[PDB]
Symmetry: C2
Subunit: 84 residues, 2 copies
């Protein structure tokens, strides 16, 4: 069981991305991403959509929003979450 | 393409739920849902998670967040969206 902030970090690390790489990919400012990863700010849904639409995060969508997976369709949990 | 507000309306109407019924199932107050549907307010990600975790909206998760579907795993667009 993970919070939004723990989930964003789990997705980013499992993709071996630095925060700066994630900022450059998503267009979310580094400082804002830092706030999201620390739990200081909760991402508005439109920003969250931008993050999950980043090509390598899309496979985490179901897990991220609903804590369910569907690997036959590519929907998985980040490796580092140790989901299941 | 549909905005967040439009997508919420599409999911609810496709599930033939009144707004009050959606309030009662999701536990999101009617006022808040009203503002989400009009665009007056944008849902925080935690609330959007709660909405998509409501059993009959889970199937729209991929479509809602990423504009993609995976029907083989039950991930579809709301019928009224006329997706594809
Ligand atoms: Na890297
Ligand atoms: Na109804």
């Amino acid at each position: 069981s993970n919070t939004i902030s723990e989930k964003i970090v789990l997705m980013r690390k499992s993709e071996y991305l630095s925060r700066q790489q994630l900022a450059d990919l998503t267009g979310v400012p580094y400082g804002t991403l830092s706030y999201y990863e620390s739990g200081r700010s909760t991402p508005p849904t439109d920003v969250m959509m931008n993050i999950l639409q980043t090509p390598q995060f899309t496979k985490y969508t179901l897990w991220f929003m609903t804590n369910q997976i569907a690997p036959e369709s590519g929907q998985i949990a980040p490796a580092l979450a140790h989901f299941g």
